[PDB]
Amino acid sequence: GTVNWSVEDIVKGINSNNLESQLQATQAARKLLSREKQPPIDNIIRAGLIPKFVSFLGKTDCSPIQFESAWALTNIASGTSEQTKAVVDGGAIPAFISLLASPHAHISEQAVWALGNIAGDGSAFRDLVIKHGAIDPLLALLAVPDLSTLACGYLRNLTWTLSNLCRNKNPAPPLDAVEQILPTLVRLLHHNDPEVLADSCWAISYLTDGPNERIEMVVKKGVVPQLVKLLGATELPIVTPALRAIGNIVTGTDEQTQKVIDAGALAVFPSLLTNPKTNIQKEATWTMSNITAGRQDQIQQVVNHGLVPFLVGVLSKADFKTQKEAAWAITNYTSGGTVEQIVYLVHCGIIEPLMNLLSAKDTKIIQVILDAISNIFQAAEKLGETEKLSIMIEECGGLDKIEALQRHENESVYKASLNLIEKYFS
Ligand SMILES: NCCCC[C@H](NCc1ccc(-c2cccnc2)s1)C(N)=O
């Protein structure tokens, strides 16, 4: 029937003055654009079919051609950014918004998907979708007492599109729109479907990726306890954005950070800091580096939870990117911690792994580690313990690492190195 037409025959059908011929040609176009092996999107675009597909969106009296052009357009809008642009230039945004209220679920869902792909392309199109008024009718599709009554695919689709309306930066989405979407988002974040939970978490991670006022409008909604719960999930597609969202949130105020701790996040981190997935361990360690940049009493909760040994571990052995995050976590810990917190740190074995990373061929981490070492000598000075400390560093081969760095490419390490030698070593 409509399997494997050429673009030429699709054009002749769509150009005919016969709605049924048009329907059959549009279905042919839809199937062509759906094939796995390199969909001929650009030939379709070049043929001038997007405006006709768009006009078909408006034919209330022929729902199957509405459905078929929507799907065809959706295939094009899910391609490259130039292909998505072509669809927007064809007038598709408001035509799809009008289809959200279609009595046919398959057509409504198709409009939901199309809008998510358009909004998901970038900030400008995101904000353009919002200006045309997509948010009210999208939220209205979720206005039922129990989300469980909605079809699984429908709900996943709606959640995914809502998360694209939350997604990009420069600029971030409008504050007005964020506030409008958030209560539905909070609701989806407790919905029992792994894909809905994942996309909800992604949406939260986007919204917390910015200044503290952005973080705050999310945190005030009370979601931190649910985020922490999801942080312990067994499904990696759930943990990954929950952890991103949590990581974003502790880049905020001491108060915002405390809420993460109060909700019990720190209990999850022995597993996160030893997670077999590299990016989870990395982001967990990044999250910790921001927690140790906090108040002394928050450093103390990290101590209390037995997390310092796990930080020593990540520093000792991890993907190098992870070890760089661990290095930051230590410098922040040592800059803000009490003398006795820094003593405890050394008692857990931080010195040797710290010195071993002075071998790394990256300047940034060397300055971070030198920084940390200086902080620890500062604690040792107030205890008159600099010699006991110097010996420790000497015995594990830390001295040879440091004087090597006087004769080093960059200036601020030479300088920082030289100070250390002259000051605490003979
Ligand atoms: N809730 C605290 C927000 C902390 C911001 C920062 N603290 C120093 C750093 C935090 C994490 C940093 C980092 C840098 C590079 C790689 N990984 C972590 S710096 C600061 N001194 O205002």
Ligand SMILES: NCCCC[C@H](NCc1ccc(-c2cccnc2)s1)C(N)=O
């Ligand atoms: N140099 C760019 C501007 C300052 C860099 C600093 N730290 C940047 C980061 C590098 C490692 C980070 C990280 C790691 C894993 C996941 N997400 C972020 S932060 C920051 N405050 O941003």
